């Protein structure tokens, strides 16, 4: 009798270990994706505007998917920080897509202590910095 009953108990234990292992693996098998992007970008800064002109890109991406951050200055548009938003890009505009041939103008404001030589900015896509004016 007893060697067969002991075998049935060990099968029951084995299934719970396998079910446990499956939940451990689930912490590895997510959140990996191709996030690399690369663009030819040129820029010019003035007391009132930043100009951004794109010559080429690795892929065609929405101007709403790109986040812009700034130091030494402030944006004249206050709703948020996507490139489409601060640049005043309408959905019908040619500049709705970030690719070679797209140009943007961003309006900015400086304090009494701030100066043009102190201003810099960065473009971020999927958590990677794709451009930095101070490079």
Ligand X SMILES: *[C@@H]1O[C@H](CO)[C@H](O)[C@H](O[C@@H]2O[C@H](CO)[C@@H](O[C@@H]3O[C@H](CS(=O)(=O)O)[C@H](O)[C@H](O[C@H]4O[C@H](CO[C@H]5O[C@H](CO)[C@@H](O)[C@H](O)[C@@H]5O)[C@@H](O)[C@H](O[C@H]5O[C@H](CO)[C@@H](O)[C@H](O)[C@@H]5O)[C@@H]4O)[C@H]3O[C@@H]3O[C@H]([C@H](O)CO)[C@H](O)[C@H](O)[C@H]3O)[C@H](O)[C@H]2O)[C@H]1O
For residue 58, give the nearest of 109, 104, 98 by alpha carbon.
Answer: 98
Rounded distance, CA 87 to CA 106, Å?
5
Selected binder of a second copy within 90, 92, 113, 127 (CB under 8 A): 127
Shortest Cβ 83–ligand X spacing (Å)? 9
Residue among 26 and 112 whose Cβ is closer to a second copy = 26
Residue 49: how many CA atoms within 13 Å on its side-chain side? 10
Kindly state whether residue 106 participates in binding a second copy, applying the rule CB under 8 A: no
Using CB under 8 A as the criterion, what x/- string covers residues 43-62 for binding a second copy?
Answer: ------------xxx-xx--
Return the SS3 of 17: helix
105 binds a second copy per the rule CB under 8 A: no
User: Residue 120 CB: number of other CB atoms within 10 A?
Assistant: 17
Rounded to whole angstroms, the Cα distance separating 76 from 60 reads 27
Per partner kind, with CB cut-offs from 5 to 8 A, the member of a second copy, ligand X, none near residue 59 is: a second copy
Which residues would be at the binding site for ligand X (CB under 6 A)?
Answer: 62, 64-65, 87-91, 93, 95, 104-105, 107
């Amino acid at each position: 009798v007893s060697p067969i009953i002991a075998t049935i108990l060990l099968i029951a234990i084995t299934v719970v270990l396998a079910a446990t292992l499956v939940t451990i693996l689930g912490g590895f098998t997510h959140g990996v994706s191709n996030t690399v992007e690369t663009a030819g970008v040129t820029s010019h800064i003035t007391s009132k505007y930043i100009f951004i002109n794109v010559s080429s890109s690795s892929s065609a991406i929405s101007a709403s998917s790109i986040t812009i951050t700034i130091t030494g200055a402030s944006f004249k548009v206050t709703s948020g920080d996507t490139l489409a938003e601060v640049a005043g890009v309408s959905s019908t505009s040619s500049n709705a897509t970030f690719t070679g041939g797209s140009d943007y103008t961003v309006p900015i404001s400086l304090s009494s202590s701030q100066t043009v030589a102190g201003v810099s900015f960065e473009l971020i896509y999927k958590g990677n910095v794709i451009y930095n004016s101070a490079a």
